Motif scaffolding. Structure first.
Motif, PDB file in Angstrom:
ATOM      1  N   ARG A  85       0.827  -1.200   0.000  1.00 51.68           N
ATOM      2  CA  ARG A  85       0.000   0.000   0.000  1.00 51.68           C
ATOM      3  C   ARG A  85       0.865   1.256   0.000  1.00 51.68           C
ATOM      4  N   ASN A  86       0.389   2.298  -0.678  1.00 54.54           N
ATOM      5  CA  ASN A  86       1.115   3.563  -0.769  1.00 54.54           C
ATOM      6  C   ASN A  86       0.884   4.350   0.515  1.00 54.54           C
ATOM      7  N   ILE A  87       1.862   4.301   1.425  1.00 54.67           N
ATOM      8  CA  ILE A  87       1.762   5.026   2.690  1.00 54.67           C
ATOM      9  C   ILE A  87       2.201   6.478   2.560  1.00 54.67           C
ATOM     10  N   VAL A  88       2.762   6.871   1.417  1.00 51.37           N
ATOM     11  CA  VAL A  88       3.179   8.251   1.198  1.00 51.37           C
ATOM     12  C   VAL A  88       2.060   9.013   0.502  1.00 51.37           C
ATOM     13  N   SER A  89       0.870   8.419   0.461  1.00 55.21           N
ATOM     14  CA  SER A  89      -0.267   9.063  -0.176  1.00 55.21           C
ATOM     15  C   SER A  89      -0.733  10.260   0.651  1.00 55.21           C
ATOM     16  N   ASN A  90      -1.531  11.117   0.014  1.00 55.04           N
ATOM     17  CA  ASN A  90      -2.029  12.321   0.664  1.00 55.04           C
ATOM     18  C   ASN A  90      -3.043  12.030   1.762  1.00 55.04           C
ATOM     19  N   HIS A  91      -3.581  10.812   1.825  1.00 54.23           N
ATOM     20  CA  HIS A  91      -4.586  10.469   2.822  1.00 54.23           C
ATOM     21  C   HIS A  91      -4.014   9.757   4.038  1.00 54.23           C
ATOM     22  N   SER A  92      -2.807   9.207   3.940  1.00 54.47           N
ATOM     23  CA  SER A  92      -2.188   8.555   5.086  1.00 54.47           C
ATOM     24  C   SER A  92      -1.783   9.599   6.121  1.00 54.47           C
ATOM     25  N   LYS A  93      -2.125   9.342   7.383  1.00 52.89           N
ATOM     26  CA  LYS A  93      -1.880  10.311   8.443  1.00 52.89           C
ATOM     27  C   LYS A  93      -0.464  10.251   9.000  1.00 52.89           C
ATOM     28  N   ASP A  94       0.311   9.214   8.673  1.00 49.93           N
ATOM     29  CA  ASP A  94       1.661   9.099   9.217  1.00 49.93           C
ATOM     30  C   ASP A  94       2.555  10.229   8.718  1.00 49.93           C
ATOM     31  N   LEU A  95       2.574  10.450   7.401  1.00 52.75           N
ATOM     32  CA  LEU A  95       3.412  11.500   6.835  1.00 52.75           C
ATOM     33  C   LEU A  95       2.989  12.877   7.324  1.00 52.75           C
ATOM     34  N   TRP A  96       1.683  13.127   7.404  1.00 55.22           N
ATOM     35  CA  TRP A  96       1.199  14.426   7.858  1.00 55.22           C
ATOM     36  C   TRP A  96       1.510  14.653   9.334  1.00 55.22           C
ATOM     37  N   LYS A  97       1.395  13.608  10.157  1.00 56.66           N
ATOM     38  CA  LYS A  97       1.778  13.732  11.559  1.00 56.66           C
ATOM     39  C   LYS A  97       3.270  14.001  11.700  1.00 56.66           C
ATOM     40  N   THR A  98       4.091  13.327  10.891  1.00 54.62           N
ATOM     41  CA  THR A  98       5.530  13.570  10.914  1.00 54.62           C
ATOM     42  C   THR A  98       5.842  15.010  10.518  1.00 54.62           C
ATOM     43  N   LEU A  99       5.166  15.503   9.479  1.00 52.05           N
ATOM     44  CA  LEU A  99       5.363  16.885   9.052  1.00 52.05           C
ATOM     45  C   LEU A  99       4.927  17.864  10.133  1.00 52.05           C
ATOM     46  N   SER A 100       3.823  17.567  10.822  1.00 52.75           N
ATOM     47  CA  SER A 100       3.359  18.437  11.898  1.00 52.75           C
ATOM     48  C   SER A 100       4.352  18.457  13.054  1.00 52.75           C
ATOM     49  N   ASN A 101       4.905  17.293  13.404  1.00 59.75           N
ATOM     50  CA  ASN A 101       5.905  17.238  14.468  1.00 59.75           C
ATOM     51  C   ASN A 101       7.154  18.022  14.083  1.00 59.75           C
ATOM     52  N   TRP A 102       7.594  17.875  12.831  1.00 61.61           N
ATOM     53  CA  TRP A 102       8.750  18.625  12.348  1.00 61.61           C
ATOM     54  C   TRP A 102       8.482  20.125  12.381  1.00 61.61           C
ATOM     55  N   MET A 103       7.273  20.530  11.990  1.00 64.92           N
ATOM     56  CA  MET A 103       6.864  21.929  12.061  1.00 64.92           C
ATOM     57  C   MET A 103       6.903  22.436  13.496  1.00 64.92           C
ATOM     58  N   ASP A 104       6.395  21.634  14.433  1.00 67.27           N
ATOM     59  CA  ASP A 104       6.392  22.038  15.835  1.00 67.27           C
ATOM     60  C   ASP A 104       7.815  22.221  16.349  1.00 67.27           C
ATOM     61  N   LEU A 105       8.713  21.305  15.978  1.00 70.51           N
ATOM     62  CA  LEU A 105      10.108  21.436  16.390  1.00 70.51           C
ATOM     63  C   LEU A 105      10.764  22.655  15.753  1.00 70.51           C
ATOM     64  N   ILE A 106      10.426  22.951  14.497  1.00 70.19           N
ATOM     65  CA  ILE A 106      10.968  24.134  13.833  1.00 70.19           C
ATOM     66  C   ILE A 106      10.509  25.399  14.549  1.00 70.19           C
ATOM     67  N   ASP A 107       9.223  25.465  14.883  1.00 68.54           N
ATOM     68  CA  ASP A 107       8.658  26.624  15.563  1.00 68.54           C
ATOM     69  C   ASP A 107       9.081  26.721  17.022  1.00 68.54           C
ATOM     70  N   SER A 108       9.568  25.632  17.615  1.00 71.44           N
ATOM     71  CA  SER A 108      10.064  25.677  18.984  1.00 71.44           C
ATOM     72  C   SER A 108      11.377  26.436  19.105  1.00 71.44           C
ATOM     73  N   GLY A 109      12.202  26.423  18.061  1.00 70.23           N
ATOM     74  CA  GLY A 109      13.454  27.152  18.091  1.00 70.23           C
ATOM     75  C   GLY A 109      14.631  26.388  18.654  1.00 70.23           C
ATOM     76  N   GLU A 110      14.552  25.059  18.702  1.00 70.86           N
ATOM     77  CA  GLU A 110      15.643  24.234  19.206  1.00 70.86           C
ATOM     78  C   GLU A 110      16.539  23.668  18.117  1.00 70.86           C
ATOM     79  N   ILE A 111      16.008  23.418  16.926  1.00 70.34           N
ATOM     80  CA  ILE A 111      16.776  22.857  15.821  1.00 70.34           C
ATOM     81  C   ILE A 111      16.941  23.940  14.762  1.00 70.34           C
ATOM     82  N   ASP A 112      18.183  24.188  14.358  1.00 70.12           N
ATOM     83  CA  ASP A 112      18.453  25.190  13.336  1.00 70.12           C
ATOM     84  C   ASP A 112      18.099  24.643  11.960  1.00 70.12           C
ATOM     85  N   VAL A 113      17.073  25.231  11.338  1.00 68.55           N
ATOM     86  CA  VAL A 113      16.614  24.764  10.037  1.00 68.55           C
ATOM     87  C   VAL A 113      17.676  24.954   8.960  1.00 68.55           C
ATOM     88  N   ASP A 114      18.553  25.950   9.109  1.00 71.15           N
ATOM     89  CA  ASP A 114      19.592  26.177   8.113  1.00 71.15           C
ATOM     90  C   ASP A 114      20.627  25.060   8.081  1.00 71.15           C
TER      91      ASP A 114
END
Lengths: 379, 355, 377, 354
Positions: free
Chosen positions: D34-63
């Protein structure tokens, strides 16, 4: 090619600054490319050195050479400038390889007025009107006889050895007392990097490219102390129970063998004590002659080993109450055997043979003893 | 100027060993009222030369790098000695050899053997006279040595000058005594002298060795007065009935530990808070060994248990480090006594109810 | 006149920097064909170093050095020795420069961009007022070669100090770079390169440096300085800590073992301090690369063998005594002995050994009471 | 290729850590389970949301951070391709616009993640630019070994099957710490470089004697050695030790016999260095024999042997093999080797008994 030649000319220009620093006092200050090629001021005198390197099968400095006459003209121009005190100024010319010429032989030798009078030629007797060139250097060098004679009498010529790194290593080995020859490359690599960094940092800021001998000495001392970490003292023990000197020692009955006999130890314990004592007496001499250990920390080792024996004496006398004295003595001896092998000599680790031999050496003078009453049976 | 108690004749040898090359052996020797008796008639001098010549013909030393130093406590004047000292050239030595031989012509039988031993060759004697150097005693020996060390040695440690010149002046005397007791030549290698000097300096350069100069002993006025005053830690040892020597050792260790703590804190080697962790881990060790002996030797008299605990802590607390640095036995024992002084730790099982 | 010497200085200072950014196959030549000639094997980089000690733009608009370098590169291209397909030309200066010609040269990589930078470059440079104008004729006589050079050009400037740039490159590129002894490594790695270059030049041998030898020397220096032999950790917990009391009250599997042998309250608080500090120290050292788990289970295997020896010793020495006293004696005998062991051949404190003992007692691997696997199974 | 037992998704997390600079904090999540990288699978979107939260926290340098993802084998989708193939700022903006146009359906399962990710534009663009999707391949160990040999300056060609082992162990340890602490899987290249330098320095130093112990109670050679009853096992049966001590004696003796050969062949320890080590332990045994025969006098002869054995076990670990530290197993195996030749023994009358 030409760029390689110039780069090598500068490479034997930084390799000579380190060598001139290694042979200086704590007051010298050696400049780089400030007034001359290498200018060194020791407060009392001053040395000007010029380094030239072609060595392409041809004599760099000969009777008729552009570079040698250019160097002489520059030296005389500096003399005429009046800034350099010529009373105690030494002029030096260094070449990386051997070079022989009549002009060099006359200039290097004849360091006296009576010999400077009969030096070189009268005016143009030797060189005899050279080919058309710039030619101003010749009359610059031969316009005043007094300064020419002074330069002749204050001239020195120094050869190389065919390799600048080898010459630097030889100078370090010869001049520095206690030079670490084991880590010879690692010191020389780091003492060139520091000099290069200092020179570059001084040059980028347009500051004078001078090096004080004090900073060089401090850095050299720090490097050598970093590499002086021989934590374990080394000594090869080869004696065994069949050795002639061991049997002679037991038969001669010194004081520590008498002390061991007072507590009735077996035959294999008398031969194992003479081995250790003899090896300790041999080791304390080899280490003293090599500068590893002197007889000021050996008297501090023997002071820790005596407090250890004093502690073990109370411990054993507490543990062994009512037992025969010949067993209390053996127990104290064994307790001292297991405990004294934890101290260091000059914060350097030593083997069990050294600790046991030191125990028997202190028991030799009746400083420490195993039998409960040893100072009355041997006093 | 390190201790000013060393003999005059070993300040000059250290001075001349500082101003040498890594490959050069200084063959120090000596000869010895007040009057200028020392002259051409001297036997030992000639004998010394013979010994030197005997070492020249033996081949164990290199003549090209060897400086024969001869010392006199006072100023002695003699034409032969001045000829040997002032000759620093091949032709000068060649002339001086025949001049000396003509001077000592028709000698006494006491020196005839030495003259025959010295006159067995020509080039060896010339080289020996060329490398010969005679220096008399100087009124300012230690100051000259200090100035030479500060001027000549690259990397001269200005912070510890009175203590570096103490260990290097004692090593020189050690080699002098070793050569004087083995009936051997007194050849002192500048390589080994340089190695000793490097070790001495690197001991003070390295920020891992915790150096201290322990000099207290039993017959000291701060030890006996401390014992007589009977402070808290001495009064703790009197509950377990230790002998009078243990009190002396406790006082010595405590005084030296206090002085070393002050010195190491002032020098910046050890911080003020790094001693408290040392004390905390030593107190944990004491607490561990207190219940080990209250379990092993149960039912014994309390004085015996206190003595056993004291000895166990003496043997066990020497394995600890002060700020990742090694410390001596005196420091650990003095720290134990300092803690016992505040009644933080104790030896008798009921020490808190008695003091 | 320190200009030529300073050029040679920041000529050798860029060979050390260019080696730190190379693979294990590159060979960089110093003054062989160009100023710096890097030969990875797939490609090749020619770099020319220009040094100016003044604030003026050295390559302003018509500098003789820039045209000399361009003509030398054109001559190298025309010689046919180099491979123009994968050859990269780089120019380095100790200070930043601002030139229209330089901006147009390094900002054109496409063929159309190369043509636009070639035909428009003849705006103000088409006036050979000074002498030796043959460099301009060489640069502007072949359209294809000029376009290739334009599309294969790159300008990199320094920061103002060659040693600082070298240190920054070492910090950025070398994984696990020792910033503690940063000066000593940079001093020793500059003396080795200089020694190698001088030895190769004095015998008229090629002055090339292999990246493998540089890597081996750098590894040796870093390993020499990477010998701590002591693991550091600051213990601040005391018997009054909130987590210590909570741990004691929660009754984990190692306080239960200690309660079986009837130890005092001071021994329960001294055991919860050590265990918590040991867990924190393990996490901190594993995150910093000081120690990994493969070496922690080897530490826990030496201590489990030691406990197996002290168990027999105590059971032999304490025959007939109550089991609680035997357990206490075994516990104390383990406290004294396990502190002689090392972690990764690095010395650890007593807190670590005691906390490891209680961590293994937590898993019921080792125990103090004679029957601990039965009463706690 | 060190053990070929490590998980696939950590062979090319070490590989990407090798080919990096000292300042690069990388991430890693395996969204396959099954295509888990599809737009409907919640795993990738949850991972992206967690990465966004860490970026907005200011602990990991995005550069200085690469968001390596990972999907077992390979899976593919339009949004995943837009996330992976876009690196430029303008390309990142175009990919973000394409993603936003793609997500127009409500999708309440991933609506919260979409709202969390869509509240910002610059952060999302930077995250997409630094995003890099690596799909598992099939030659991971060979790739890692080749990359280590090619990229690392000062690559140790002598001990290479064992450096990779330790470094992959450390990488897996950090992965497990991140997965058990419920915290982001950020593996700094600085700490990875420090571990790699420590491993290489430990394998290139000439002070520590290294050996890798893989002998246990159920090993075949241990049981055969115990059953064969050689001299040193027969010496332990005089003092009546437990059955669990014979196993440890056999383990130590076998490991010492292997390590002696390994260190002699490697050149670490010479032939005569392991004859003053044996002469040092025999003197210790001689001392401890007299200590116990004085302390525990009158005890049964089988009890004195056990006491002497355990005293020698505790005491002989303080010695050095030619100024090099050795483990407990080496000292105990050397003791058993000497007891095999009947030069040292445990029972008081072991000479006249066997």
């Amino acid at each position: 090619t030409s760029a390689v030649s110039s780069w090598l000319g500068y490479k034997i220009q930084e390799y000579r600054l380190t060598q001139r620093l290694l042979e200086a006092n704590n007051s010298s200050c050696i400049g780089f490319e400030i007034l001359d090629d290498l200018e060194e001021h020791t407060g009392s005198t001053s040395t000007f050195e010029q380094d030239k390197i072609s060595t392409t099968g041809r004599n760099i400095v000969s009777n008729h050479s552009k570079d040698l006459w250019k160097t002489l003209s520059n030296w005389m121009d500096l003399i005429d400038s009046g800034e350099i005190d010529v009373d105690n100024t030494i002029f030096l010319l260094f070449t990386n390889k051997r070079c022989h010429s009549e002009v060099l032989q006359l200039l290097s030798t004849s360091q006296a007025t009576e010999e400077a009078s009969k030096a070189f030629d009268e005016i143009l007797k030797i060189v005899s009107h050279p080919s058309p060139s710039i030619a101003n250097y010749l009359n610059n060098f031969s316009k005043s006889k007094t300064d020419a004679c002074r330069l002749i009498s204050k001239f020195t010529y120094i050869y190389g050895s065919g390799s600048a790194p080898h010459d630097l290593r030889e100078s370090y080995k010869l001049h520095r007392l206690g030079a670490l020859e084991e880590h010879l490359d690692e010191i020389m690599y780091e003492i060139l990097g520091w000099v290069s960094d200092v020179l570059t940092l001084a040059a980028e800021k347009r500051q004078p490219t001078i090096v004080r001998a004090k900073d060089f000495g401090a850095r050299l001392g720090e490097i050598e102390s970093k590499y002086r970490q021989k934590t374990i003292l080394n000594y090869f023990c080869n004696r065994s129970s069949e050795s002639e000197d061991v049997q002679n020692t037991i038969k001669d009955a010194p004081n520590y063998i008498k002390q061991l006999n007072l507590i009735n130890v077996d035959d294999s314990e008398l031969e194992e004590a003479a081995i250790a004592n003899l090896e300790t007496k041999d080791a304390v001499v080899e280490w003293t002659l090599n500068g590893d250990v002197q007889d000021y920390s050996y008297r501090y080792y023997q002071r820790e080993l005596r407090r250890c024996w004093g502690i073990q004496k109370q411990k054993i006398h507490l543990d062994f109450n009512g037992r025969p004295e010949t067993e209390v003595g053996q127990r104290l001896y064994i307790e001292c055997l297991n405990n004294v092998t934890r101290y260091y000599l000059e914060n350097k680790k030593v083997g069990d043979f050294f600790a046991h031999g030191t125990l028997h050496s202190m028991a030799d003078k009746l400083t420490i003893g195993w039998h409960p009453e040893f100072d009355k049976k041997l006093g």
